[PDB]
Design a protein around this ligand. Structure first.
Ligand code: AR6
Length: 248
């Protein structure tokens, strides 16, 4: 039997294409300065922060650190695979209206990828980090978008090194734009493509702070930076807790 709410979520899945770039930013324009946005930086999985936030969240979204070319990356410690294994996310990403995101990114043949985004509405979270069933599934809206593959650019197309940060910046700005366009209140963010994609975590953390301070100030009610870091150094979390203490 097909698990609860997968149908309604897959049927509602929706693609934002790069030609919606200005539709997304006028949605940020229109929503800027609506709340006193409270923001944290934590050590939880993105789904653990989602399930915690749920009961006081009118509209909850979370960022999938996605593969540009294969849904769920093709599966093996990554965050996108954590969400697929414990939610209906995969049934949404393989949905027909989502195909152009993968199709175009592969034809792109560029490690900075395109600006397509996939919006997955009311994705059921079925399991906690331990992997046991929840009593009841917890819905979370998911924004899927690929951070530029910095590691690949450095080994494959170093001429696009200068475009890495600008790509991540305009794409981050569209991720906020999709969440305001869908009028979300509570965002679960994190160390976006600072793992397998090898971006600088100080840089991703700073880009988020620039946006949350600039074009997206006030635009959301709560932003939680759910960075998981098991390495004894904790380099990712340290960079996000260090660079976003200004904002909290
Ligand atoms: N479940 C998790 N929850 C919250 N944060 C996490 C989690 N797992 C890792 N992090 C933290 O977030 C950081 C980045 O996690 P990454 O999964 O590497 O995303 P990317 O931007 O580097 O590239 C995504 C590729 O990886 C896959 O193959 C995709 O299919 C893509 O191909 C990690 O270092 C953790 O600190």
């Amino acid at each position: 039997v097909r698990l609860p709410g997968l149908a309604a979520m897959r049927q509602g899945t929706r693609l934002f294409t790069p030609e919606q770039g200005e539709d997304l930013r006028e949605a940020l324009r229109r929503r800027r300065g609506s709340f006193q946005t409270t923001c944290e930086v934590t050590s939880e999985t993105t789904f653990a922060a989602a399930r915690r936030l749920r009961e006081k969240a009118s509209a909850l979204a979370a960022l999938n650190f996605a593969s540009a070319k294969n849904p769920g990356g093709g599966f093996a410690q990554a965050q996108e695979e954590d969400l697929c294994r414990g939610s209906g996310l995969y049934f949404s990403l393989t949905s027909p209206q989502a195909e152009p995101y993968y199709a175009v990114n592969r034809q792109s043949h560029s490690a900075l990828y395109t600006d397509h985004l996939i919006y997955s509405p009311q994705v059921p979270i079925f399991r906690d980090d331990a992997g046991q069933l929840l009593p009841a599934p917890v819905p979370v809206n998911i924004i899927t978008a690929p951070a530029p593959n910095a590691g690949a650019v450095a080994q494959s197309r170093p001429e696009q090194l200068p475009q890495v940060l600008p790509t991540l910046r305009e794409r981050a700005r569209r991720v906020l734009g999709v969440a305001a366009w869908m009028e979300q209140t509570h965002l679960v963010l994190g160390a976006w493509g600072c793992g397998v994609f090898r971006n600088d975590p100080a840089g991703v953390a700073r880009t988020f702070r620039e946006l949350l301070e600039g074009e997206a100030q006030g635009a959301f009610e709560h932003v939680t930076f759910a960075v998981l870091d098991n390495h004894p150094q904790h380099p990712r979390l340290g960079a996000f807790r260090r660079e976003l203490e200004s904002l909290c």
